[PDB]
């Protein structure tokens, strides 16, 4: 039961279906009590019988509507379960990830399969807390909440943090994702080499893997928090370990376009 723009109040239709049900059920007893003409006792029991399903599941016998404005289906129960309005679609269309990031990608020529390159400005937010802590370890901040402030305005970030951000990262890796993830290669993991700008420097060889060219596709980065997760990620999911096709013998990372041209 929420508060919005001034008097504007928000609330799942469900509440209205319930009230309905309550007032009926209540008129029930109260009716029976005060003597009892048959026609009515049923009429009410009938109405009630309708209400009972209302919240349970609408449209399976009829559709009740909030007083005029929208002939909208007060979203009954299963409707939320099943996603009888794309709800399930968006549901199994995944949730959201706390430590995500999406940018534009760019070729990283002299890069190495093993690595990948994301912008600091990005990295900074990403493993933010892993940084806060390192922040307190170095003398660039005494305590957390404090350090937090340091990293709140771009202008107050001493050029000592970057060195700190470099630490955190060292060893660690992240995952990059393409638009339609069609196969396992669809997501691959690299140890980021902090770069400049606003762009994600991706390795040429893997462009075959992620069907991805460089005219404006954007990849997404994922941070594997868990010492366990990070652990698996940089062992069984690190690009440089999945050179062949799980679909057929043929290798996936192979000399492409320009490269061939030269050799």
């Amino acid at each position: 039961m929420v508060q919005v723009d001034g008097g504007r109040f928000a609330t799942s239709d469900l509440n209205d279906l319930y009230r309905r049900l309550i007032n009926r059920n209540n008129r029930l007893k109260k009716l029976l009590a005060q003597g009892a003409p048959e026609i009515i006792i049923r009429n009410e029991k009938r109405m009630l019988q309708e209400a009972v399903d209302a919240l349970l599941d609408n449209g399976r016998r009829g559709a009740p509507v909030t007083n005029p404005g929208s002939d909208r289906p007060l979203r009954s129960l299963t409707d939320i379960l099943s996603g009888k309005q794309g709800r399930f679609r968006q549901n199994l269309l995944g949730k959201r990830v706390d430590y995500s990031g999406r940018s534009v990608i760019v070729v990283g020529p002299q890069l190495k399969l093993h690595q990948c390159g994301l912008p600091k400005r990005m990295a900074l937010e990403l493993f933010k807390p892993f940084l806060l802590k390192k922040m307190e370890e170095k003398g660039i901040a005494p305590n957390v909440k404090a350090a937090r402030r340091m990293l709140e305005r771009q202008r107050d970030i001493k050029d000592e943090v970057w060195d700190a951000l470099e630490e955190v990262i060292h060893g660690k890796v992240v995952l990059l994702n393409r638009a339609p993830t069609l196969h396992r290669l669809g997501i691959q993991a690299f140890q980021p080499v902090l770069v400049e700008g606003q762009s994600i420097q991706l390795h040429p060889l893997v462009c075959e893997a992620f069907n991805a060219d460089f005219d404006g596709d954007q990849m997404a980065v994922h941070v594997p928090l868990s010492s366990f997760a990070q652990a698996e990620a940089r062992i069984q999911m690190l690009s440089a370990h999945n050179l062949l096709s799980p679909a057929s013998g043929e290798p996936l990372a192979k000399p492409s376009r320009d490269i061939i041209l030269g050799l």
Binding site: I39, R42, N43, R46, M47, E50, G62
Partner: peptide, 12 residues
């Protein structure tokens, strides 16, 4: 099958 009529009918 749609309430209203039944009652309106049952009454009459």
């Amino acid at each position: 099958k749609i309430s209203t009529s039944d009652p309106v009918r049952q009454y009459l």
